[PDB]
Amino acid sequence: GSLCGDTCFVLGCNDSSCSCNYPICVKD
Numbered sequence: 250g251s252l253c254g255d256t257c258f259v260l261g262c263n264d265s266s267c268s269c270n271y272p273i274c275v276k277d
Contacts, residue, residue: 250277
């Protein structure tokens with residue numbers, strides 16, 4: 250329910266729980 254920190258717009262989310270909510274990834 251917060252930002253993962255990384256971005257999926259470049260390559261992809263690092264954490265498996267982080268969804269590709271372009272541009273930034275989010276988890277929980």
